[PDB]
């Protein structure tokens, strides 16, 4: 996993190992990459994309924090007009005087503690580091990096953008953090580890305006 | 950027081969099966297939 432990806290270590058992970090990263690729496939025609390619990421790339590699590759069938690297939430972005055919997407998961839980800054720094990095191999100089802080469940991306990519990524990330099975399993495991649960709103006791459902196909009993 | 301007209706769903919406836990189990390239045992296979045709018989009536 990508967790870094400052000092030996054996109890926390065993708890985190229990939570993340069974390659959960890898499963989450792979599921997120696949979901994003599926959304790109859905909106290919609107985005004038040629194809979506699942770049053969290294198996340990999910927690290879020192370096990185490309995750998704959008082939255009045309030269898009790309933007200067600006935060995903930056509504106002200017156009970079360049055009590209291949556009790469990178996904970076982090385990943010209290000190360094700023997804915006972390994604900015990691993009501006990997892009210039000599050991980081990317198909094209132009692309985007999306960072997900698991601990605080935050999301933000920084790199270049082409028309439509910004709204697409925004809504895709929102529906992701809402309804991704991998993150759901992570949240449930964290809840179980903390032994903290949520209550329920009793039951709509059958009323004179609700009794009509009594004779539906469902078999009902009155005690 | 001179972006296009529109609303992307991004919908992410997990479904089985029968077109039924998949529960998150079962979806994760299938993800893990495909990830590790291996499956369950004979008894669990029998149990799950028996549950499948049990629900089929229950709903057919």
């Amino acid at each position: 996993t990508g967790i870094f432990m400052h000092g030996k806290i054996p109890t926390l270590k065993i708890s985190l190992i229990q939570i993340f058992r069974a390659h959960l970090w890898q499963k989450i990263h792979e599921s997120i990459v696949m979901d994003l690729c599926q959304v790109f496939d859905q909106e290919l025609d609107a985005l004038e994309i040629e194809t979506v390619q699942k770049e053969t990421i290294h198996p340990r790339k999910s927690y290879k924090m020192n370096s990185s590699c490309a995750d998704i590759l959008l082939f255009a069938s045309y030269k898009w007009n790309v933007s200067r690297p600006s935060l995903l939430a930056d509504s106002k972005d200017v156009m970079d005087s360049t055009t590209t055919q291949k556009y790469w997407i990178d996904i970076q998961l982090r385990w943010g503690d209290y000190d360094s839980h700023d997804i915006e800054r972390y994604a900015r720094a990691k993009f501006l580091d990997y892009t210039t990095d000599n050991m980081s191999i990317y198909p094209s100089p132009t692309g985007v990096l999306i960072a997900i802080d698991l601990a605080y469940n935050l999301h933000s991306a920084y790199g270049n953008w082409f028309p439509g990519s910004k709204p697409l990524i925004q809504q895709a990330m929102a529906k992701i953090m809402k309804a991704n099975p991998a993150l759901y399993v992570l949240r449930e495991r964290i809840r179980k580890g903390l032994q903290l649960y949520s209550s329920e709103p009793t039951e709509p006791y059958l009323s004179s305006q609700n009794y009509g459902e009594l004779f539906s196909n469902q078999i009902i009993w009155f005690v | 950027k001179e972006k296009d301007g529109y609303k992307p209706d991004v919908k992410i769903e997990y479904v089985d081969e029968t077109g039924r919406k998949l529960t998150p836990k079962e979806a994760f189990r299938q993800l893990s099966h495909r990830f590790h390239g291996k499956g369950s045992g004979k008894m669990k296979t029998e149990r799950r297939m028996k549950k499948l045709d049990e629900e089929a018989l229950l709903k057919k009536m």
Binding site: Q26, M34, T56 | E13, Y14, Q30, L31, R34, F35, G37
Partner: peptide, 21 residues
């Protein structure tokens, strides 16, 4: 529609350290 998420193998591959497609 939705496609089974095409995954890969980590251990006991008997192949090169790098990835297949």
């Amino acid at each position: 529609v939705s496609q089974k998420r095409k995954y890969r193998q980590y251990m006991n591959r008997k192949g090169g350290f790098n990835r297949p497609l």
